[PDB]
Design a protein around this ligand. Structure first.
Ligand code: MG
Ligand code: ZN
Lengths: 50, 1340, 402, 157
DNA sequence: AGCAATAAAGTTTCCTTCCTCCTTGCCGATAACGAGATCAACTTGTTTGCGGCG
């Protein structure tokens, strides 16, 4: 959950990354253009340990 | 003897006339729970005690009230066996009588307002077996009986606490049974102080005011009045002669007209005699004697009202003048013989700040309730609560009793709440020993320790639940309606059951039981501790409790308690030990009267003995006279010494009463070291029964009683004749006289066959009885796992001769033949149990089904259609048991597995398997399955097959039952038709039902046909009834956790044979490892070609001093010959009279053994069977200290026609030449153990890891890696081999990159290294910064 | 993380973070209203209390617990006591490529040898095997190695024998007091599931053969391999650094053999006859013509290097027991004959060996020791050796004294 | 409500079973005949049968000692399903170069199609858009690549 | 054998879409009961420092 302790939002900082139909999101695949709709996307950065 | 005893007799060499046969051994648990449950009317215990303790409840107003009346229980739904099978606790209903009575609060006590007298169910409770256990959830368990300190009072004195002083400090302590403790103390400065529950120190006297006392009365109580009197100018003073005692004269001590003690002069005992003699108390004295004295009582000017001197204030001569003229010609003061009478209270007072009572309560409150506003009534209520509320305080009049004895009162009993007199008296007793009179006492003295039992635990948890009820009950009484609120509407039964379930499931006392061997259980339930609640702790507790105390004698066995850190703490009960009614101990003793030992008994305490004297049993008694010898070693006062003969009061009974049974059974204890006797009996429980049950030959006498009282076996409930026999069950017919009328009297016994223990072992029973044979009551009818003919059988007797052999017996290691491996006669079985559950997911249900994808049919071949194995199979690691499957969601794959599926193209379902499989390393035989499934669900089909064949079984059993019964009844149903005419065989030939119409006469007999049909109806109705009930109960589904769909469960069977490493030993600490097995042909052998079984290392006889094992060994060789001498005759088939004489003389050897038997009594067939049993060897009883003698060992051996020492010529199997010397040879009876080579071995290359730190685990169960300690580091550093450690810490522990690339390099042949940094390091760094710190590192 | 039945398991840290956050958020909400101050005060009391209790619970104020009545464990005890990373996790290590078993004895062995039951060692040198089965091309890839291996072909055992020669290992009893508690041995595979052990190092390990266990470790790399072959090997580890004594004491048995045989009766036979050498004492006694324990004259050839480290032969005759003659058979060419002319108490053997080392160098001492073991075990078995109730002696002069 | 993180109507139903089961247990005076629960709360069996999961199961903690003094915790008796394994990725990469090995003799676009889609995890029909042939030739050629890789052997099945 | 066409079949998308459900926030209706404690710990123990504590 977001705003949390395991906060998804810190790994997925909201205001972020959704495609139109809602396939790729939440930092999961940084360098993904959602191909069916061909929508290009930016700006995401990853820790797990920090 | 009895039939079972006629089968096989064990000789004895005991000689002392025994008085007693041992009692019922485990009476105690039975008793405790018996009294706990039982409806006591008045002399309450437990449950009624608890109710009548919480005698009724009324409202927050005081308007309405519940009332207790009485209770009752039900009987259980399920029998025992279904409960253990089903997986449930075995429990009883509870049924309560209650009366809701209400008061009219308009009326004064207009009690007729409302009565609702009904009854109430509330909660089940567990009950006990005839054995002792409680099963829970299908798990047999036991709880332990406890020891701890009594309640009451306790005195002590520390010695130089502030060691600078090196001074004593006395103090007293009070411990209610329930409620607050309390502590009274002294200081370095001779002043009294107090604390509750170790609160901070306070002056004592504060509380005295807090109980509405003035200093006047205070020192009136504590202090005797030193009265001066001012007769018109001068000081005269009253004197008791024995006040000036060891004291010296301050002035010219004299009389009105006579001098006794001059200046500077000690008031000797003479002058005390003078002063008592010549009748003087009033003596002129200087006024100056006062100045320094203390006023006793606050003296005033009665006109003013002014404290000229506040009480407890030193005196003077200006104050003398003012006081004298005030109208005080008499001044009480304190006596101060600081030697004896010190004014410690006066001192304690004038340190104390307070005078009024109220502020003292305030300050006590302020300590106890800090910060809170000092509201008056709150302090009063607090104080009354702590010791004067029945709610939160108690004594358990045992406390009251012990206390009154520590008061030296007379009344045993009292209240559960304090009084003022008692408190005053404890202050007095404290100050008196502080002056010196009397003493503090000890802890280890058992007279101060009380035991505590299962019943009480039940009491306390139960009433706790009652209190949980009390809360909301009062909450609702005052408020809700009264007319309509049924008494049961208010209640709940969760919490009660919760506590009950808890400590029957949560306590450190409640444990699994040790199902390994009879001894294990019976001892483990006779096991004592002082741990858990109301007890102690290992690291805190020290040596003083661990050690021995003399009072242990005859109550506690000193010779069984482990090597662990809990050495002396737990210790088992003695044999004839009993408990006082209170929770103390007692032990029987033989009275010694006029020198004669009276044959009576008294179970005497842990206190009483210290007064009297007791005689020892090793004493030789002068045959209806008295103790033969003059200086008899008797004992008293915590020690032993030598006393006369007429002098004695009492005697012990036996020579055994000290020991445990685990201790008692090795014979010839009387010739060996103690510590290893400990080790012997400690491992003696830890054994395993073999496949078969081989006897010993050297005994003590007791094995039968434990063979019985363990309760494993069949028994003769009631005499009879064997009716039906089989390898699985038995039917008996009961003897007529014993067959009481109502039932037809046919007991039956279904037996327990291959069944699993909690230590994972084979359990089973077997007959040692035949068919068409009578039965006496009580005897057994079938053996248990580890016995024979009602006698213990947990090892095997075998040959041995001892000498070195080529370094295969270096340090106690063992060497053996191999023929016994052919015999498989130490081989045993280990049942293993395994399960697999169906569960309902969030998505849907898991399923169980044969069909699964990507499976070779090889697996499936052994499964049925539902996906379940065929019974009887034989299986191995990797094999599959249960085709369980799981409906799954989906995944977002990537091209790797995309393409592997592009290649293989085997479709992924929406399901996976969750199948049950054989664990790696295991292989065995399936022999049984069960399944459990819920009420609500369709029963998976094979489980219906199993319910159907179980119904088949049960139906068959009950059919057998009622068919037999009703067949006995068909006897009547034929015979009574015969009454009233004759159809001699026109009766019989035509079908038997068609007899009712046959020749038929009026008067009484129409009713007889009606009686016939009546019984017919009765019986068929009973049958349908019984089927209905039982078929429902069997068909009744299961009660399950949430989410569960059903479960499967499997058993297994695997059988373990010897490989070296196997641990074994005997009965003298004679441990040993096995290194090698010998072919026969290298075995040392004899004149007659017999090689030996076992070989040994005799260097460790004297160093260990396990010498009695030798004595056995003489006998080990010895009695064998007799059997051979008989079997020789047997195969020769000589004659009965030969057997007769030979046997009688075998029993007629000794001087003065007690048992005396004849056999012209016995029949021929008895001789035949007896001889036929004896062929393997003649067994014997060696009582422990009333044992046999060397005369007698060598007497039997000389009849046996052999070397007297029994040490003889042997030649080598290898080479076939004689050794140098003869060697002693014989048989031992020895054992095997559970520390097995396969149970312990483990290796590990590579596998699982941790997660938070990623280094490996430990445990063979979880594929464990081994640990590498600092000590191993230190050693390595001592060498200085860096790279080892580098590897040890990087790659094989943490560095994951490291482990990977090294694995890579090795399989490439490359034996090289690269390091990194452990993760575990930086974790710490990340903890450090978490704590708010700039930890960091300086780069190179 | 979740459990089998969906249940959870957690870290209490979280719980402490939460209260903090709640209180702070409350405080903001409160502050937006400018509320009366007392609730603010309480808010910050509870704040700092939450804070430090996070750091270290029951230090300042009394501790926070769960429902169990047990503390909500803070940070600091990640670092502390035994439990901390230092004493648990960081210095002490769980290890793979390791194992253990119960042990036992190999008498006949040589010191450097150690018993290995098949399957564990089989498991342990697995990746070597895989490399060599791709080497030979039996296992062209890895799965074939795996599959033939779980099939346990004879070639598997052949290549096992191929590898493990010259492939030493590390041994551990617990607890490690001094540095000899571990040693470095060389394998010998055996058919069981229990290790054999060369008897004499019972003492370096404080071991007794009554059910103890040892573990095994591996110098995977070569550096450590060579160190152990060069440092911890059984040959280096023969004298205490504490005090310069042999730790190779033959304790209890072989001593007995030597004392028994190397002994001078008078009674038996053949008293006072003549021989060339010890080979005739063998010749007779193995035919069984003479008491070994019998002073009789024979001829011996003793050697010496009074020269600058060069031998000096000579010979002469001796009235001596036969065993002394025999035992001269084995002495390696440097000693006098006085060495044997007593019946060999324990320390005689100590000094036997001490002298042997300090003069002759090292390896002859080792060899000497080995044969002492073998032969004394042999003649101990020959010995005839047992005790009885009759070997117990009671002086008649006890009862009167009492 | 703030501290708890489970829904509300959940606890309504929990309170309801509590009231009901106690009410009816006193009506009867004995226990555990759930069909009665199905009756009195006559909505369905499966509803409560789920609810018991939903409600009657709460969380626990991680470091509780393992019972018979402190031999180990629950943190040492834990298992995982999502583990690393070294040879599957090894042989997957092996098969990757086997893919290019197989297809390098086959048509130029499909070579690049399957390379750049399978290698660097890029776009498939991006290429179908490049050629504009309808991706039927794609279809049969992809089939052929499978037929080409079904000419060799590999376990890990 | 390589190349395309027509027809069929199965889709994945995917997007709405309107039913239904479900969850986040708020505000309300009779009148007054009592400052907590509540179920524990059993005092390890010797050494060493520091604040008093004169
Ligand atoms: Mg040992
Ligand atoms: Zn999209």
């Amino acid at each position: 959950e977001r705003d949390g302790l395991f906060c998804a939002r810190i790994f997925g900082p909201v205001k972020d990354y959704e495609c139109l139909c809602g396939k790729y999101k939440r930092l999961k695949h940084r360098g993904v253009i959602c191909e069916k709709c061909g929508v290009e996307v930016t700006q995401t950065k990853v820790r797990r340990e920090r | 003897y009895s039939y079972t005893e006629k089968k096989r007799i064990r000789k004895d060499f005991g000689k002392r006339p025994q008085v007693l046969d041992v009692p019922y051994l485990l009476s105690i648990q039975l008793d405790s729970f018996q009294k706990f449950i039982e409806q006591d009317p008045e002399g309450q215990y437990g449950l009624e005690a608890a109710f009548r303790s919480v005698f009724p409840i009324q409202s927050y107003s005081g308007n309405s009230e519940l009332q207790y009346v009485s209770y009752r229980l039900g009987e259980p739904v399920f029998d025992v066996q279904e409960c253990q099978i089903r997986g449930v606790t075995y429990s009883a209903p509870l049924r309560v009588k209650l009366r809701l009575v209400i008061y009219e609060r308009e009326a004064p006590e207009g009690t007729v307002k409302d009565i609702k007298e009904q009854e109430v169910y509330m909660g089940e409770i567990p009950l006990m077996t005839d054995n002792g256990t409680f099963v829970i959830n299908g798990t047999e368990r036991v709880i332990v009986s406890q020891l701890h300190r009594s309640p009451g009072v306790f005195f002590d004195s520390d010695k130089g606490k502030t060691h600078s002083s090196g001074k004593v400090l006395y103090n007293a302590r009070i411990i209610p049974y329930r409620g607050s403790w309390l502590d009274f103390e002294f200081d370095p400065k001779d002043n009294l102080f107090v604390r509750i529950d170790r609160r901070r120190k306070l002056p004592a006297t504060i509380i005295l005011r807090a109980l509405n006392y003035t200093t006047e009365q205070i020192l009136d109580l504590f202090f005797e009045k030193v009265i001066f009197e001012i007769r018109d100018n001068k000081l005269q003073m009253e004197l008791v002669p024995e006040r000036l005692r060891g004291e010296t004269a301050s002035f010219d001590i004299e009389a009105n007209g006579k001098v006794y003690v001059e200046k500077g002069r000690r008031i000797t005992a003479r002058h005390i005699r003078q002063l008592e003699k010549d009748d003087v108390k009033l003596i002129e004295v200087p006024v100056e004697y006062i100045a320094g004295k203390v006023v006793a009582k606050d003296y005033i000017d009665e006109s003013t009202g002014e404290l000229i001197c506040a009480a407890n204030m030193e005196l003077s001569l200006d104050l003398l003048a003012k006081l004298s003229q005030s109208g005080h010609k008499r001044i009480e003061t304190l006596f101060t013989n600081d030697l004896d009478h010190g004014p410690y209270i006066s001192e304690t007072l004038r340190v104390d700040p307070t005078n009024d009572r109220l502020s003292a309560l305030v300050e006590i409150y302020r300590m106890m309730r800090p910060g809170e506003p000092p509201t008056r009534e709150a302090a009063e209520s607090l104080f009354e609560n702590l010791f004067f509320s029945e709610d939160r305080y108690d004594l358990s009049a045992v406390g009251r009793m012990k206390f009154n004895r520590s008061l030296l009162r007379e009344e045993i009993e009292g209240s559960g709440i304090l009084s003022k007199d008692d408190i005053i008296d404890v202050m007095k007793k404290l100050i008196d020993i502080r002056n010196g009179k009397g003493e503090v006492d000890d802890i280890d003295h058992l007279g101060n320790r009380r035991i505590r039992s299962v019943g009480e635990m039940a009491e306390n948890q139960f009433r706790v639940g009652l209190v949980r009820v009390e809360r909301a009950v009062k909450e609702r009484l005052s408020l809700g309606d009264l007319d309509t609120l049924m008494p049961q509407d208010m209640i709940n039964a969760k919490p009660i059951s919760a506590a009950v379930k808890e400590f029957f499931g949560s306590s450190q006392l409640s444990q699994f039981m040790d199902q390994n061997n009879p001894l294990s259980e019976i001892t483990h339930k006779r096991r004592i501790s002082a741990l858990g609640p109301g007890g102690l702790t290992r690291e805190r507790a020290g040596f003083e409790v661990r050690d021995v105390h003399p009072t242990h004698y005859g109550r506690v066995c000193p010779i069984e308690t482990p090597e662990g850190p809990n050495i002396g703490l737990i210790n088992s009960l003695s044999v004839y030990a009993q408990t006082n009614e209170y929770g103390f101990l007692e032990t029987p003793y033989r009275k010694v009267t006029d020198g004669v030992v009276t044959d009576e008994i008294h179970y005497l305490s842990a206190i009483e003995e210290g007064n009297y004297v007791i005689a020892q049993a090793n004493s030789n008694l002068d045959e209806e006279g008295h103790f033969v010898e003059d200086l008899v070693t008797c004992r008293s006062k915590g020690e032993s010494s030598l006393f006369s003969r007429d002098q004695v009061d009492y005697m012990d009974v036996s020579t055994q009463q000290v020991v445990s049974v685990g201790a008692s059974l090795i014979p010839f204890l009387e010739h060996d070291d103690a510590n290893r006797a400990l080790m012997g009996a400690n491992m003696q429980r830890q054994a395993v029964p073999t496949l078969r049950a081989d006897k010993p030959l050297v005994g003590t006498g007791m094995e039968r009683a434990v063979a019985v009282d363990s309760g494993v076996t069949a028994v003769a409930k009631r005499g009879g004749v064997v009716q039906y026999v089989d390898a699985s069950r038995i039917v008996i017919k009961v003897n007529e006289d014993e067959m009481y009328p109502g039932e037809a009297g046919i007991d039956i016994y279904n037996l327990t066959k291959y069944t699993r223990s909690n230590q994972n072992t084979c359990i089973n029973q077997m007959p040692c009885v035949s068919l068409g044979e009578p039965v006496e009551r009580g005897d057994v009818l079938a053996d248990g796992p580890s016995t024979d003919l009602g006698e213990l059988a947990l090892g095997q007797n075998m040959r041995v001769a001892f000498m070195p052999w080529n370094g295969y017996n270096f340090e106690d290691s063992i060497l053996v033949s191999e023929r016994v491996v052919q015999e498989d006669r130490f081989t045993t079985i280990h049942i293993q149990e395994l399960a697999c559950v169906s569960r309902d997911t969030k998505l849907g249900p898991e399923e169980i089904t044969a069909d699964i994808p990507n499976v070779g049919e090889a697996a499936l071949s052994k499964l049925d259609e539902s996906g379940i194995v065929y019974i009887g199979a034989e299986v191995t690691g990797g094999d599959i048991l249960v085709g369980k499957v799981t409906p799954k969601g989906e995944t977002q794959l990537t091209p790797e597995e995309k393409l592997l599926r592009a290649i293989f193209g085997e479709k992924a379902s929406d399901v996976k398997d969750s199948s049950l499989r054989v664990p790696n390393g295991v292989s065995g035989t399936v022999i049984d399955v069960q399944v459990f499934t819920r009420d609500g669900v369709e029963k998976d089909k094979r489980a219906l097959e199993i319910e159907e064949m179980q119904l088949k079984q049960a139906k068959k059993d009950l059919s057998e039952e009622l068919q037999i019964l009703e067949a006995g009844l068909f006897s009547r149903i034929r015979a009574v038709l015969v009454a009233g005419g004759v159809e001699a065989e026109k009766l019989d030939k035509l079908p038997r039902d068609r007899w009712l119409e046959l020749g038929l006469t009026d008067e009484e007999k129409q009713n007889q046909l009606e009686q016939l049909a009546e019984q017919y109806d009765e019986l068929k109705h009973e049958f349908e009834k019984k089927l209905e009930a039982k078929r429902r109960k069997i068909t009744q589904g299961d009660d399950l956790a949430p989410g569960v769909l059903k479960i499967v469960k499997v058993y297994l069977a695997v059988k373990r044979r010897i490989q070296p490493g196997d641990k074994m030993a005997g009965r003298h600490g004679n441990k040993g490892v096995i290194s090698k097995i010998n072919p026969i042909e290298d075995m040392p052998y004899d004149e007659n070609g017999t090689p030996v079984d076992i070989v040994l290392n005799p260097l460790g006889v004297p160093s260990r001093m396990n010498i009695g094992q030798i004595l056995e060994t003489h006998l080990g060789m010895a009695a064998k010959g007799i059997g051979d001498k008989i079997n020789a005759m047997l195969k020769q088939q000589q004659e009965v009279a030969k057997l007769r004489e030979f046997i009688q003389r075998a029993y007629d050897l000794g001087a003065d053994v007690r048992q005396k038997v004849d056999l012209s009594t016995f029949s021929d067939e008895e001789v035949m069977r007896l001889a036929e049993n004896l062929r393997k060897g003649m067994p014997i009883a060696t009582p422990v200290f009333d044992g046999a003698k060397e005369a007698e060992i060598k007497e039997l051996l000389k009849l046996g026609d052999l070397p007297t020492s029994g040490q003889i010529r042997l030649y080598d199997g290898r080479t076939g030449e004689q050794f140098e010397r003869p060697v002693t040879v014989g048989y031992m009876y020895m054992l095997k153990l559970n520390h097995l080579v396969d149970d312990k071995m483990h290796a590990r290359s590579t596998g699982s890891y941790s997660l938070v730190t990623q280094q490996p685990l430990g445990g063979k169960a979880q594929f464990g890696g081994q640990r590498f300690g600092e000590m191993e580091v230190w050693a390595l550093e001592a060498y200085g081999a860096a790279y080892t450690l580098q590897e040890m810490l990087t790659v094989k522990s943490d560095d994951v990159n490291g482990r990977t690339k090294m694995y890579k390099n090795i399989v490439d042949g490359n034996h090289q290294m690269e390091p990194g940094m452990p993760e575990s390091f930086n974790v710490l760094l990340k903890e450090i910064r978490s704590l708010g710190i700039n930890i960091e590192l300086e780069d190179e | 993380v979740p459990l089998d039945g969906g249940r959870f398991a957690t870290s209490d840290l979280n719980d402490l973070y939460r209260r903090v956050i709640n209180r702070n958020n409350r405080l903001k909400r409160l502050l937006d209203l400018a509320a009366p101050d007392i609730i603010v005060r309480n808010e910050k009391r509870m704040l700092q209390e939450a804070v430090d209790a996070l750091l270290d619970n029951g230090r300042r104020g009394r501790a926070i617990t769960g429902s169990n009545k047990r503390p909500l464990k803070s940070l600091a005890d990640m670092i502390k006591g035994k439990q901390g990373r230092f004493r648990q996790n960081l210095l002490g290590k769980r290890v793979d490529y390791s194992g253990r078993s119960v042990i036992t004895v190999g008498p006949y062995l040589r010191l450097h040898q150690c018993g290995l039951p098949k399957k564990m060692a089989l498991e342990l040198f697995k990746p070597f095997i895989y490399g060599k089965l791709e080497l030979r091309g039996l296992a062209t890839t890895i799965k074939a190695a795996k599959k033939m291996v779980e099939r346990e072909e004879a070639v598997v055992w052949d290549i096992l024998d191929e590898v493990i020669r010259e492939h030493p290992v590390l041994l551990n009893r617990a607890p490690t007091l001094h540095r000899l508690g571990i040693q470095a041995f060389e394998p010998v595979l055996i058919e069981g599931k229990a290790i054999q052990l060369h008897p004499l190092v019972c003492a370096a390990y404080n071991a007794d053969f009554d059910g103890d266990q040892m573990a095994v470790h591996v110098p995977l790399t070569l550096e450590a391999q060579l160190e152990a072959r060069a440092l911890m090997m059984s040959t280096n580890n023969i004298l205490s650094p504490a005090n310069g004594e042999p730790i190779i004491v033959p304790s209890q048995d072989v001593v007995l053999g030597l004392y028994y045989m190397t002994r001078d009766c008078v009674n038996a036979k053949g008293e006072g006859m003549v021989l060339t050498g010890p080979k005739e004492a063998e010749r007779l006694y193995r035919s069984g013509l003479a008491s070994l324990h019998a002073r009789v004259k024979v001829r011996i050839t003793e050697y010496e290097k009074d020269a600058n480290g060069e031998l000096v032969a000579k010979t002469s005759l001796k009235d001596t027991t036969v065993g002394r003659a025999i035992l001269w058979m084995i002495v390696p060419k440097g000693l006098p004959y006085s060495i044997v002319n007593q019946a060999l108490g324990k320390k005689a053997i100590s000094k036997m060996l001490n002298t042997c080392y300090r003069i002759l160098g090292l390896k002859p001492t080792v060899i000497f020791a080995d044969q002492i073991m073998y032969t004394g075990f042999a003649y101990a078995a020959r010995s005839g050796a047992s005790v009885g109730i009759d070997d117990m002696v009671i002086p008649e002069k006890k009862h009167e004294i009492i | 409500r703030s501290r708890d993180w489970v829904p509300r109507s959940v606890r309504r139903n929990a309170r309801e079973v509590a009231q009901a089961i106690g009410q009816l247990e006193q009506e009867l005076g004995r226990n555990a005949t759930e069909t009665e629960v199905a009756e009195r709360l006559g909505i369905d069996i499966a509803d409560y049968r789920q609810m018991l999961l939903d409600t009657n199961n709460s969380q626990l903690f991680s470091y509780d000692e393992w019972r018979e003094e402190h031999g180990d915790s629950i943190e040492l008796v834990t298992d995982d399903h999502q583990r690393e394994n070294p040879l599957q990725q090894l042989l997957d990469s092996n098969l990757r170069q086997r893919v290019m090995e197989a297809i390098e003799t086959l048509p130029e676009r499909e070579k690049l199609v399957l390379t750049l889609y399978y290698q660097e995890e890029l776009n498939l029909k991006e290429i179908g858009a490049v050629l504009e042939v309808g991706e039927s030739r794609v279809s049969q050629l992809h089939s052929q690549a499978i037929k080409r890789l079904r000419t060799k052997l590999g376990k890990l099945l």
